Amino acid sequence: DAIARQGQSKDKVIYSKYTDLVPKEVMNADDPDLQRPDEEAIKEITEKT
Amino acid sequence: PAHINDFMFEQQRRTFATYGYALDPSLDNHQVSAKYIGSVEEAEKNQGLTVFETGQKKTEKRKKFKENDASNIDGFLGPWAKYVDEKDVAKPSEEEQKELDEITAKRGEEKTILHVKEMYDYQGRSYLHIPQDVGVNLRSTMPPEKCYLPKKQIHVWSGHTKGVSAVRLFPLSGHLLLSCSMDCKIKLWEVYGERRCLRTFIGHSKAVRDICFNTAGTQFLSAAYDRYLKLWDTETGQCISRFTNRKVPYCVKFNPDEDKQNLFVAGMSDKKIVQWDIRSGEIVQEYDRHLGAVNTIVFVDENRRFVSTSDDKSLRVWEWDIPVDFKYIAEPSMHSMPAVTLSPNGKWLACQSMDNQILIFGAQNRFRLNKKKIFKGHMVAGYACQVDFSPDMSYVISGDGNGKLNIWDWKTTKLYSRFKAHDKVCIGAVWHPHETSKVITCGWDGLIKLWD
Amino acid sequence: RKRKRGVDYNAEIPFEKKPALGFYDTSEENYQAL
């Protein structure tokens, strides 16, 4: 991951692992994973933008 | 982005300006005390008074005038009233004024440095005294018993800062050699002994073009690039006379006749050759039947005739001070001739023709071009290679801009040696008439060599 | 002379990128001539 992110900040997401290639499974339409930010954060980011 | 007030900063700045010490401003988290910084003991003895706060000063107020009547027609200096202890015209020293005119020339100031610690020798005698410590008479008349080709470097003079344009042998001795460099220096090296540079002459505003040694050897006429030449002495080194027609001279030759050794003939690029007396100083006669740049003119037939060359291919033999070019030569095939040297027999004018080869003519007989004497193998187109003859008329020396010192057997018309003379344009290749092996070279290379 | 990109070639590597280095000993490495 260093050779990948070479000369780059800790912001960059650099997918080079197989554990990214592997299909995750999800079966809950009621997980946290499948939930958007709630509109309070949304109005904050609207105002900043 | 600290926030401060200003009036106190301006008071601090007034102090720090006119009293020279300041309330130290460092706002360190290490609690310093209020300390006077700068001229510390000045603030201490002055009790810290700032340039703004009133305090007693018996300092002499600079002497001023006061004309405050605005009724005067030419009066009111009023608010603008000069201080009375001031000068009228701020004129800087006559010394720096003369030096500034001289420097405005320098970018010509006649400037001479003798590198010899004692300018005259152990008798009080100027180095114009020809040696007796010589192993052979440098005042002899006869040709060397046998001059040959060189095989090793002898000495190299460093002391010119750029390309050299001439080396003049002091007549009849070869004990002095003036070396003219593009850096405007005419530096005479003692050609024997230590080989070290003797005199350094300057005074031009540009490159040092040529110098001609007088038949007395005490004088030399040096033409340059900025339209003027100097008739200079040797031991004082300065110009006794100034030659100037405001024209661009390329070469100059000093007449050897003792009753005419003041008669100097300086070629000018404007069709001209000037015949001028040093003593009077004006042009005494004109030779204006050339076409343009007259590269060089030389003596012939007891020096009462002058040979000339042109880049217009006009080659001339016309008597000294007789202004009618009564012997003219310009062939269809003959190309520019830069340099012409008379064989020490006085029978031939060997002129390096810029067709990359040297041509010999009979200088005593009817302007005859001897094609049996045609020296081959140089590259002289664009360069003025100074070629010469040894005293025995057996050997010729020749330069090429390719670094080539060629040592030819002038009879067999072929070279016996071809070696590295210079790195830049090998300009002067001069055979010594009283030395057997000596080939002295100057060039655009700034190093001045003897080979033997 | 007035040659605005002519000498970019005989003089310098025209637009240069230094080979990025990774996990190995590159300094004392060097090469022989022609």
Binding site: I3, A4, S16, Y18 | - | G6, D8, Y9, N10, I13, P14, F15, E16, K17, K18, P19, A20, L21, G22, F23, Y24, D25, T26, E29, Y31, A33, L34
Partner: protein, 249 residues
């Protein structure tokens, strides 16, 4: 060599520069510029050249290739390894990268490095032939412990009966018959009831025929036939031929 040569260089350089200026896409000009440089032996020039070309198109296998080929022919071996790892980092699913990396590592001798790069490589579970060259590499050495570790990993990332078979193949040849027995057990109990079929079992019966245990050859044969999905018809004729074999021999 002062200036006739030098100006010939100046020309050819200016040309290549203008051709890549026009396109700066398709790469033949980039290459030919660079190889001309390498033939004139200025590898600093050629290096910057390959970096720029790689910038414009970092998905070019031939570009990566001949870059590293320059580095290897000039044995800046450290530089070459950096090149190879960057390659196999950005274009992993290209195989010849991995290959040439190993091969050069091998004639370099750093076989510890070769092992770990093969571990890297297999993290992607590349390919059958990849595994197989891994194993031929390991058995250029004694390292049979390694080899069976790799057959372990390979047959168990890849559910193939013939993979099982080649594992027991190597056990038989390098003479580990007890391990061959374990692997036949494991294989048949993993493949098992449903989609397990003839050929692993014919191989088992044949190995025990090498063992000349005829009664257990019979029992394994008919017991497997009967316990698992039996037969189909051409394979059953093959079962009849193999039956004559197992009974006679």
């Amino acid at each position: 060599d002062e200036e006739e040569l030098n100006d010939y260089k100046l020309r050819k350089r200016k040309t290549f520069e203008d051709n890549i200026r026009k396109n700066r896409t398709v790469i033949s000009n980039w290459i030919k510029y660079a190889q001309w440089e390498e033939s004139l032996k200025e590898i600093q020039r050629a290096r910057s050249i390959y970096e720029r070309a790689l910038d414009v198109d970092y998905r070019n296998i031939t570009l990566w290739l001949k870059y590293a080929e320059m580095e290897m022919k000039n044995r800046q071996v450290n530089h070459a390894r950096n090149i190879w790892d960057r390659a196999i980092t950005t274009l992993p699913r290209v195989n010849q990268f991995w290959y040439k990396y190993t091969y050069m590592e091998e004639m370099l001798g750093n076989v510890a490095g070769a092992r770990q790069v093969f571990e890297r490589w297999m993290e992607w579970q590349p390919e059958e032939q990849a595994w197989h060259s891994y194993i031929n590499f390991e058995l250029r050495y004694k390292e049979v412990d390694r080899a069976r570790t790799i057959y372990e990993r390979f047959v168990l990332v890849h559910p193939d009966v013939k993979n099982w078979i080649k594992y027991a193949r190597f056990e038989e040849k390098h003479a580990y018959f007890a391990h061959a027995r374990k692997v036949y057990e494991r294989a048949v109990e993993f493949f098992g009831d449903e989609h397990m079929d003839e050929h692993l079992y014919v191989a088992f019966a044949k190995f025990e025929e090498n063992q000349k245990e005829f009664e257990r050859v019979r029992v394994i044969y008919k017991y497997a036939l009967d316990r698992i999905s039996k037969q189909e018809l051409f394979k059953n004729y093959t079962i009849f031929e193999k039956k004559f074999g197992d009974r006679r021999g």
